[PDB]
PDB file of C-alpha atoms and ligand atoms in Angstrom:
ATOM      1  CA  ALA A   1      93.218 -76.288-120.740  1.00 47.23           C
ATOM      2  CA  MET A   2      92.907 -77.194-117.050  1.00 49.76           C
ATOM      3  CA  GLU A   3      96.213 -77.657-115.172  1.00 52.42           C
ATOM      4  CA  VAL A   4      95.810 -79.683-111.973  1.00 48.87           C
ATOM      5  CA  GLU A   5      98.562 -80.034-109.362  1.00 46.62           C
ATOM      6  CA  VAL A   6      99.156 -81.192-105.817  1.00 46.49           C
ATOM      7  CA  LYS A   7     100.861 -78.345-103.916  1.00 45.58           C
ATOM      8  CA  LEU A   8     102.408 -78.903-100.489  1.00 47.15           C
ATOM      9  CA  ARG A   9     104.603 -76.607 -98.423  1.00 41.94           C
ATOM     10  CA  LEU A  10     107.760 -78.068 -96.855  1.00 40.75           C
ATOM     11  CA  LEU A  11     107.920 -76.382 -93.474  1.00 39.14           C
ATOM     12  CA  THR A  12     111.701 -75.836 -93.057  1.00 39.65           C
ATOM     13  CA  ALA A  13     114.989 -75.781 -94.996  1.00 40.42           C
ATOM     14  CA  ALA A  14     115.912 -78.930 -92.998  1.00 41.54           C
ATOM     15  CA  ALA A  15     112.765 -80.722 -94.276  1.00 40.05           C
ATOM     16  CA  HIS A  16     113.640 -79.659 -97.840  1.00 35.66           C
ATOM     17  CA  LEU A  17     117.241 -80.911 -97.470  1.00 32.80           C
ATOM     18  CA  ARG A  18     116.048 -84.275 -96.106  1.00 33.08           C
ATOM     19  CA  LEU A  19     113.573 -84.624 -99.008  1.00 32.45           C
ATOM     20  CA  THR A  20     116.054 -83.785-101.809  1.00 34.90           C
ATOM     21  CA  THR A  21     118.622 -86.150-100.224  1.00 37.10           C
ATOM     22  CA  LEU A  22     116.133 -89.060-100.072  1.00 40.58           C
ATOM     23  CA  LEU A  23     114.875 -88.380-103.620  1.00 43.88           C
ATOM     24  CA  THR A  24     118.375 -88.264-105.210  1.00 43.39           C
ATOM     25  CA  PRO A  25     117.988 -91.807-106.766  1.00 39.63           C
ATOM     26  CA  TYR A  26     114.854 -90.524-108.602  1.00 40.64           C
ATOM     27  CA  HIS A  27     116.348 -87.297-109.991  1.00 40.86           C
ATOM     28  CA  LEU A  28     115.490 -86.489-113.620  1.00 43.07           C
ATOM     29  CA  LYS A  29     116.593 -82.863-114.017  1.00 46.65           C
ATOM     30  CA  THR A  30     117.160 -79.531-112.271  1.00 43.19           C
ATOM     31  CA  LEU A  31     115.730 -76.300-113.675  1.00 44.32           C
ATOM     32  CA  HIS A  32     116.764 -72.758-112.885  1.00 42.88           C
ATOM     33  CA  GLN A  33     113.683 -70.550-113.340  1.00 40.15           C
ATOM     34  CA  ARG A  34     113.145 -66.787-113.305  1.00 41.17           C
ATOM     35  CA  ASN A  35     109.469 -65.793-113.120  1.00 41.51           C
ATOM     36  CA  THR A  36     108.352 -62.299-114.189  1.00 42.11           C
ATOM     37  CA  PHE A  37     104.809 -60.879-114.059  1.00 41.11           C
ATOM     38  CA  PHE A  38     102.743 -58.260-115.870  1.00 40.17           C
ATOM     39  CA  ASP A  39      99.667 -56.186-115.011  1.00 36.50           C
ATOM     40  CA  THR A  40      98.307 -52.619-115.187  1.00 37.01           C
ATOM     41  CA  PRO A  41      99.134 -50.259-112.258  1.00 36.53           C
ATOM     42  CA  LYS A  42      95.444 -50.673-111.221  1.00 36.92           C
ATOM     43  CA  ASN A  43      95.860 -54.508-111.058  1.00 39.54           C
ATOM     44  CA  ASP A  44      93.306 -55.144-113.847  1.00 40.70           C
ATOM     45  CA  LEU A  45      94.321 -58.773-114.439  1.00 42.35           C
ATOM     46  CA  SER A  46      94.714 -59.547-110.716  1.00 43.85           C
ATOM     47  CA  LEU A  47      91.166 -58.230-110.089  1.00 47.37           C
ATOM     48  CA  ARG A  48      89.875 -60.417-112.972  1.00 47.00           C
ATOM     49  CA  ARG A  49      91.739 -63.365-111.318  1.00 48.49           C
ATOM     50  CA  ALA A  50      94.289 -63.747-114.137  1.00 51.06           C
ATOM     51  CA  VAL A  51      98.083 -64.042-113.915  1.00 49.87           C
ATOM     52  CA  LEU A  52     100.310 -63.151-116.885  1.00 47.04           C
ATOM     53  CA  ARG A  53     103.835 -64.574-116.565  1.00 44.34           C
ATOM     54  CA  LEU A  54     107.055 -64.718-118.576  1.00 43.95           C
ATOM     55  CA  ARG A  55     109.265 -67.549-117.342  1.00 44.11           C
ATOM     56  CA  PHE A  56     112.926 -67.754-118.298  1.00 44.81           C
ATOM     57  CA  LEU A  57     114.479 -71.162-117.767  1.00 45.08           C
ATOM     58  CA  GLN A  58     117.629 -73.206-118.166  1.00 42.66           C
ATOM     59  CA  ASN A  59     118.373 -76.855-117.456  1.00 43.03           C
ATOM     60  CA  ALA A  60     121.269 -76.996-114.951  1.00 43.56           C
ATOM     61  CA  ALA A  61     122.816 -80.008-116.757  1.00 43.10           C
ATOM     62  CA  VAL A  62     122.631 -78.494-120.289  1.00 41.62           C
ATOM     63  CA  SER A  63     125.395 -79.699-122.656  1.00 40.47           C
ATOM     64  CA  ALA A  64     128.646 -77.722-122.272  1.00 39.82           C
ATOM     65  CA  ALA A  65     129.731 -78.636-125.845  1.00 39.66           C
ATOM     66  CA  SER A  66     126.423 -77.476-127.390  1.00 39.34           C
ATOM     67  CA  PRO A  67     125.192 -74.218-125.755  1.00 40.00           C
ATOM     68  CA  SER A  68     121.613 -73.034-126.387  1.00 41.23           C
ATOM     69  CA  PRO A  69     119.635 -69.886-125.368  1.00 43.05           C
ATOM     70  CA  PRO A  70     117.542 -69.892-122.193  1.00 42.61           C
ATOM     71  CA  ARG A  71     113.913 -70.852-122.915  1.00 39.67           C
ATOM     72  CA  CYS A  72     111.155 -68.243-122.494  1.00 40.33           C
ATOM     73  CA  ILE A  73     107.539 -69.266-121.900  1.00 37.35           C
ATOM     74  CA  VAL A  74     104.575 -66.868-121.801  1.00 33.17           C
ATOM     75  CA  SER A  75     101.633 -68.150-119.743  1.00 34.30           C
ATOM     76  CA  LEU A  76      98.161 -66.941-118.881  1.00 34.67           C
ATOM     77  CA  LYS A  77      96.632 -68.539-115.789  1.00 36.23           C
ATOM     78  CA  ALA A  78      92.948 -67.828-115.224  1.00 37.66           C
ATOM     79  CA  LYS A  79      90.250 -68.694-112.668  1.00 35.24           C
ATOM     80  CA  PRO A  80      92.640 -70.340-110.125  1.00 35.29           C
ATOM     81  CA  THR A  81      91.439 -72.506-107.235  1.00 36.10           C
ATOM     82  CA  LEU A  82      93.779 -73.601-104.451  1.00 37.27           C
ATOM     83  CA  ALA A  83      92.488 -75.501-101.441  1.00 41.60           C
ATOM     84  CA  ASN A  84      93.272 -78.740 -99.565  1.00 40.47           C
ATOM     85  CA  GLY A  85      96.741 -78.798-101.204  1.00 38.96           C
ATOM     86  CA  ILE A  86      95.256 -79.064-104.721  1.00 41.22           C
ATOM     87  CA  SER A  87      95.632 -76.351-107.360  1.00 41.38           C
ATOM     88  CA  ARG A  88      93.311 -76.095-110.385  1.00 43.04           C
ATOM     89  CA  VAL A  89      93.756 -73.407-113.037  1.00 41.17           C
ATOM     90  CA  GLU A  90      92.857 -72.680-116.677  1.00 42.04           C
ATOM     91  CA  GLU A  91      96.233 -72.294-118.406  1.00 41.04           C
ATOM     92  CA  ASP A  92      97.421 -71.206-121.846  1.00 39.77           C
ATOM     93  CA  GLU A  93     101.167 -71.253-122.574  1.00 41.48           C
ATOM     94  CA  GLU A  94     103.552 -70.737-125.502  1.00 39.32           C
ATOM     95  CA  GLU A  95     107.313 -70.657-126.032  1.00 38.24           C
ATOM     96  CA  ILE A  96     108.779 -67.369-127.354  1.00 41.67           C
ATOM     97  CA  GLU A  97     112.286 -66.135-128.337  1.00 42.86           C
ATOM     98  CA  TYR A  98     114.558 -65.288-125.400  1.00 43.60           C
ATOM     99  CA  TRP A  99     115.519 -61.820-126.688  1.00 43.31           C
ATOM    100  CA  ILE A 100     111.881 -60.681-127.143  1.00 42.23           C
ATOM    101  CA  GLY A 101     110.944 -61.908-123.645  1.00 45.78           C
ATOM    102  CA  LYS A 102     113.830 -59.871-122.203  1.00 46.61           C
ATOM    103  CA  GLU A 103     112.679 -56.798-124.143  1.00 45.00           C
ATOM    104  CA  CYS A 104     109.084 -57.199-122.883  1.00 44.43           C
ATOM    105  CA  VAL A 105     110.352 -57.102-119.276  1.00 43.00           C
ATOM    106  CA  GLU A 106     111.697 -53.562-119.945  1.00 43.81           C
ATOM    107  CA  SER A 107     108.849 -52.610-122.312  1.00 45.06           C
ATOM    108  CA  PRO A 108     105.534 -54.508-121.789  1.00 45.20           C
ATOM    109  CA  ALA A 109     103.985 -52.806-124.872  1.00 45.66           C
ATOM    110  CA  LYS A 110     106.301 -55.062-126.956  1.00 48.23           C
ATOM    111  CA  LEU A 111     104.182 -58.101-125.956  1.00 48.60           C
ATOM    112  CA  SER A 112     102.068 -57.183-129.030  1.00 47.16           C
ATOM    113  CA  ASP A 113     105.130 -57.836-131.269  1.00 43.53           C
ATOM    114  CA  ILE A 114     105.131 -61.569-130.481  1.00 41.83           C
ATOM    115  CA  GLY A 115     101.796 -62.381-132.181  1.00 43.06           C
ATOM    116  CA  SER A 116     101.077 -65.112-129.626  1.00 43.77           C
ATOM    117  CA  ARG A 117      97.622 -66.696-129.266  1.00 42.93           C
ATOM    118  CA  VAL A 118      98.198 -66.520-125.470  1.00 42.72           C
ATOM    119  CA  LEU A 119      98.475 -62.711-125.584  1.00 39.40           C
ATOM    120  CA  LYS A 120      95.701 -62.524-128.213  1.00 44.00           C
ATOM    121  CA  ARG A 121      93.486 -64.276-125.624  1.00 43.50           C
ATOM    122  CA  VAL A 122      94.445 -61.704-122.929  1.00 41.14           C
ATOM    123  CA  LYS A 123      93.184 -58.932-125.258  1.00 45.60           C
ATOM    124  CA  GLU A 124      89.994 -60.810-126.240  1.00 42.11           C
ATOM    125  CA  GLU A 125      88.811 -62.114-122.841  1.00 40.96           C
ATOM    126  CA  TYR A 126      89.565 -59.019-120.736  1.00 40.45           C
ATOM    127  CA  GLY A 127      88.896 -56.215-123.251  1.00 44.11           C
ATOM    128  CA  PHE A 128      92.394 -54.793-123.771  1.00 43.90           C
ATOM    129  CA  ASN A 129      93.285 -53.295-127.161  1.00 41.08           C
ATOM    130  CA  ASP A 130      97.047 -53.504-126.428  1.00 40.17           C
ATOM    131  CA  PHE A 131      99.656 -53.681-123.626  1.00 40.83           C
ATOM    132  CA  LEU A 132     100.451 -49.949-123.473  1.00 41.34           C
ATOM    133  CA  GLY A 133      99.093 -49.616-119.931  1.00 41.91           C
ATOM    134  CA  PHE A 134     101.108 -52.564-118.575  1.00 43.82           C
ATOM    135  CA  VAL A 135     104.033 -52.707-116.152  1.00 43.37           C
ATOM    136  CA  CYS A 136     106.391 -55.526-115.227  1.00 45.98           C
ATOM    137  CA  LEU A 137     105.732 -56.258-111.545  1.00 46.69           C
ATOM    138  CA  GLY A 138     109.204 -57.804-111.310  1.00 46.27           C
ATOM    139  CA  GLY A 139     109.642 -61.368-110.148  1.00 45.49           C
ATOM    140  CA  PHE A 140     111.681 -64.057-108.455  1.00 48.55           C
ATOM    141  CA  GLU A 141     114.040 -67.005-108.834  1.00 47.39           C
ATOM    142  CA  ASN A 142     113.147 -70.698-108.376  1.00 44.53           C
ATOM    143  CA  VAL A 143     115.263 -73.863-108.357  1.00 42.91           C
ATOM    144  CA  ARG A 144     113.086 -76.803-109.444  1.00 38.90           C
ATOM    145  CA  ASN A 145     114.256 -80.395-108.940  1.00 39.67           C
ATOM    146  CA  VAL A 146     112.252 -82.909-111.002  1.00 43.79           C
ATOM    147  CA  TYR A 147     111.906 -86.565-109.922  1.00 42.26           C
ATOM    148  CA  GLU A 148     110.397 -89.664-111.479  1.00 43.05           C
ATOM    149  CA  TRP A 149     108.908 -91.367-108.425  1.00 47.93           C
ATOM    150  CA  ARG A 150     106.190 -94.054-108.059  1.00 48.16           C
ATOM    151  CA  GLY A 151     104.602 -93.333-111.464  1.00 47.55           C
ATOM    152  CA  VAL A 152     104.525 -89.527-111.101  1.00 51.14           C
ATOM    153  CA  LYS A 153     106.778 -86.531-111.735  1.00 54.31           C
ATOM    154  CA  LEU A 154     107.590 -84.730-108.479  1.00 55.13           C
ATOM    155  CA  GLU A 155     108.712 -81.109-108.496  1.00 57.30           C
ATOM    156  CA  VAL A 156     110.621 -79.940-105.431  1.00 59.12           C
ATOM    157  CA  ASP A 157     110.988 -76.148-105.394  1.00 60.57           C
ATOM    158  CA  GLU A 158     113.339 -73.771-103.637  1.00 60.43           C
ATOM    159  CA  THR A 159     111.887 -70.308-104.238  1.00 58.63           C
ATOM    160  CA  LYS A 160     114.328 -67.518-103.463  1.00 54.11           C
ATOM    161  CA  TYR A 161     112.480 -64.307-102.622  1.00 53.78           C
ATOM    162  CA  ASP A 162     114.162 -61.081-101.406  1.00 56.69           C
ATOM    163  CA  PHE A 163     112.489 -61.711 -98.021  1.00 54.60           C
ATOM    164  CA  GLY A 164     113.673 -65.353 -97.695  1.00 57.56           C
ATOM    165  CA  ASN A 165     113.365 -68.881 -99.096  1.00 56.10           C
ATOM    166  CA  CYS A 166     110.207 -70.986 -99.411  1.00 57.65           C
ATOM    167  CA  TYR A 167     110.065 -74.734-100.112  1.00 59.98           C
ATOM    168  CA  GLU A 168     107.367 -76.712-101.926  1.00 61.62           C
ATOM    169  CA  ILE A 169     106.531 -80.085-103.489  1.00 61.91           C
ATOM    170  CA  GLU A 170     104.326 -80.052-106.563  1.00 64.53           C
ATOM    171  CA  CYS A 171     102.934 -82.801-108.787  1.00 63.38           C
ATOM    172  CA  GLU A 172     101.006 -82.207-112.017  1.00 64.73           C
ATOM    173  CA  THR A 173      98.371 -84.962-112.172  1.00 63.42           C
ATOM    174  CA  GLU A 174      94.871 -85.851-113.363  1.00 61.60           C
ATOM    175  CA  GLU A 175      94.448 -87.832-110.108  1.00 62.15           C
ATOM    176  CA  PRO A 176      95.268 -85.265-107.372  1.00 59.59           C
ATOM    177  CA  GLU A 177      93.457 -87.007-104.450  1.00 57.42           C
ATOM    178  CA  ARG A 178      95.223 -90.362-105.026  1.00 53.30           C
ATOM    179  CA  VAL A 179      98.631 -88.750-105.655  1.00 53.65           C
ATOM    180  CA  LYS A 180      98.360 -86.346-102.664  1.00 52.05           C
ATOM    181  CA  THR A 181      97.625 -89.357-100.404  1.00 52.08           C
ATOM    182  CA  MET A 182     100.678 -91.211-101.795  1.00 52.86           C
ATOM    183  CA  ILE A 183     103.013 -88.177-101.377  1.00 54.27           C
ATOM    184  CA  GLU A 184     101.741 -87.481 -97.822  1.00 52.39           C
ATOM    185  CA  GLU A 185     102.155 -91.133 -96.754  1.00 51.53           C
ATOM    186  CA  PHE A 186     105.811 -90.944 -97.893  1.00 50.57           C
ATOM    187  CA  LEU A 187     106.484 -87.597 -96.173  1.00 50.90           C
ATOM    188  CA  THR A 188     104.812 -88.888 -92.982  1.00 53.78           C
ATOM    189  CA  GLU A 189     106.883 -92.124 -92.933  1.00 54.22           C
ATOM    190  CA  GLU A 190     110.067 -90.109 -93.533  1.00 52.99           C
ATOM    191  CA  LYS A 191     109.092 -87.402 -90.982  1.00 48.50           C
ATOM    192  CA  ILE A 192     109.464 -84.549 -93.492  1.00 47.09           C
ATOM    193  CA  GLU A 193     107.389 -81.646 -92.118  1.00 44.34           C
ATOM    194  CA  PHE A 194     104.700 -80.364 -94.478  1.00 45.60           C
ATOM    195  CA  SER A 195     101.290 -78.739 -94.854  1.00 45.99           C
ATOM    196  CA  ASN A 196      98.972 -77.785 -97.718  1.00 44.23           C
ATOM    197  CA  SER A 197     100.246 -74.834 -99.725  1.00 43.27           C
ATOM    198  CA  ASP A 198      97.469 -72.199 -99.403  1.00 42.94           C
ATOM    199  CA  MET A 199      99.149 -69.532-101.577  1.00 42.39           C
ATOM    200  CA  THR A 200     100.630 -69.546-105.087  1.00 38.32           C
ATOM    201  CA  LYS A 201     104.272 -68.481-105.549  1.00 35.13           C
ATOM    202  CA  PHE A 202     103.015 -65.241-107.148  1.00 34.61           C
ATOM    203  CA  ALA A 203     100.722 -64.517-104.163  1.00 37.26           C
ATOM    204  CA  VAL A 204     103.664 -65.012-101.750  1.00 37.37           C
ATOM    205  CA  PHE A 205     105.784 -62.671-103.934  1.00 38.68           C
ATOM    206  CA  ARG A 206     103.028 -60.010-103.938  1.00 38.00           C
ATOM    207  CA  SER A 207     102.544 -60.231-100.143  1.00 39.02           C
ATOM    208  CA  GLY A 208     106.260 -59.431 -99.592  1.00 39.02           C
ATOM    209  CA  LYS A 209     106.628 -61.875 -96.653  1.00 40.36           C
ATOM    210  CA  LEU A 210     106.925 -65.617 -95.860  1.00 39.49           C
ATOM    211  CA  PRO A 211     103.516 -67.425 -95.639  1.00 38.30           C
TER     212      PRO A 211
HETATM  213 MG1  LIG B   1     103.142 -74.646-109.547  1.00 33.66          MG
END
């Protein structure tokens, strides 16, 4: 299925702080995310324009009386396009057990144990028989604040790389041009510095420096 999102970079930590402060009345939830990535040493998926990710996540306001495991989501993102602050990608995703996700980080060959349609599709589309030639590329931490604002769900990200923090606003929408205009009008009125995001979080990670 096609995932479509507005993607804007917040230019400073100060801009990000101003935004999260102003959006506090609209807060829905806060997610702590760890993103991990998988490819061959020869970058076979990356060269075929595919990204294979395991995301581990927890809701920051999870019940203290009723603990639950972190969630683990496997995703395949294919044929991405990112321009003019709009991201479009073919995406397949599935939830998997936390313990198996953790084991796949250390041993990518164990991705075959899951029996996921997502991973089945990786094998079928790109001509892999298994995940024996795969490594975990490592990954990074993201704090995602989610807001219900003017008919849309806003995601405000603080991505914490080894080389520094990056700040973004995202919005998953079937009407990206209309929604981008609405977000930008708000940011402009509030003087919150921004530009189009020209790189995915994974691309920034791989580059090893701030965009
Ligand atoms: Mg995104």
